[PDB]
């Protein structure tokens, strides 16, 4: 069995590289962040431009949604994160504390917390309600490329160009686990599987790996694409067949069969590196976003 993703819409508007796209948990929206300092909101089904959200003084590397789809948090080169009320487009809180570019961000499932990773090599945990930084974790020895909470918010996984994936106890701040194969290529992306039992990790040697968290071993390996330079988002696609989805530096979206590790689709259309992909929470819809020579977001839809 294979998916049949086909291009449906191209979302144009950003004036610089698009850095990250994410679907709202309610499925209504796509948020995109860009080097142009802006967040844009688009209809998830029709691709229709909804609104521009502005405020950051420099470009943005990541955006993420609260579980109730009412808030966004963005991570910027201006050293801040901002929490945004989506409906009004207003900045509710500016999270200050990082001493270098903020690179990645995510809410926990309860959405009372935000986790951030920075070029300052730390991971921070923020109280959404007060905007106060609860913990500064001395997580890594190189920029932090990704941060993600598990199912129940009890754990945070982080990755870094230092070659490490680390798993943190949210409540205590303790490092519970360090994952690494018999080598140290930079880890460019990490996230928990939807059931929280696995971790998908990208490394800058053209490879994605599925790790069993509890056992601490690599189970599956996905290859064939190009990823040597950029921190490209990857995904578990679950609304239809069970796929792994990633961007690639050859301007394609790659889709693998999770179980068999075979490439099942390569989506062509972008004209620069596909830095970000996202999967719709209920429908078979993939959003992809590309760097500066392209500037577009594409929505792709499939029957499985």
């Amino acid at each position: 069995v294979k998916p049949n993703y086909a291009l449906k819409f191209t979302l144009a508007g950003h004036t610089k590289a698009v850095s990250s796209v994410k679907f709202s948990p309610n499925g209504e929206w796509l948020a995109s962040s860009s080097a142009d300092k802006l967040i844009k909101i688009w209809g998830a089904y029709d691709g229709k431009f909804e609104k521009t959200i502005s405020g950051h003084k420099l470009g943005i590397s990541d955006v993420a949604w609260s579980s109730d789809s009412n808030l966004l948090v963005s991570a910027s080169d201006d050293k801040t994160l901002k929490i945004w009320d989506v409906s009004s487009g207003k900045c509710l809180k500016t999270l200050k504390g990082h001493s270098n570019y903020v690179f990645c961000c995510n809410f926990n499932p309860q959405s009372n917390l935000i986790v951030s990773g920075s070029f300052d090599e730390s991971v921070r945990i923020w109280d959404v309600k007060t905007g106060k930084c609860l913990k500064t974790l001395p997580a890594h020895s190189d920029p932090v490329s990704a941060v993600h909470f598990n199912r129940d918010g009890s754990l945070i996984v982080s990755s870094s160009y230092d070659g490490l994936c680390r798993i943190w106890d949210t409540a205590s701040g303790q490092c519970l686990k360090t994952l690494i194969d018999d080598d140290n290529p930079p880890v460019s992306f990490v996230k928990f599987s939807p059931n929280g039992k696995y971790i998908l990790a990208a490394t800058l040697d053209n490879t994605l790996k599925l790790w069993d968290y509890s056992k601490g071993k690599c189970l599956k390996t996905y290859t064939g694409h190009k990823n040597e330079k950029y921190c490209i988002f990857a995904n578990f696609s679950v609304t239809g067949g069970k796929w792994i989805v990633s961007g690639s530096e050859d301007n394609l979206v790659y889709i693998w069969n999770l179980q068999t590790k075979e490439i099942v689709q390569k989506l062509q259309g972008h004209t620069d590196v596909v830095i970000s992909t996202a999967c719709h929470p209920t429908e078979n819809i993939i959003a992809s976003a590309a760097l500066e020579n392209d500037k577009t977001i594409k929505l792709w839809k499939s029957d499985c």
Partner: peptide
């Protein structure tokens, strides 16, 4: 100051 506007848009 990142030439391409954002850290994720640069090589490291």
């Amino acid at each position: 100051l990142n030439p391409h506007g954002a850290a994720r848009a640069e090589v490291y």
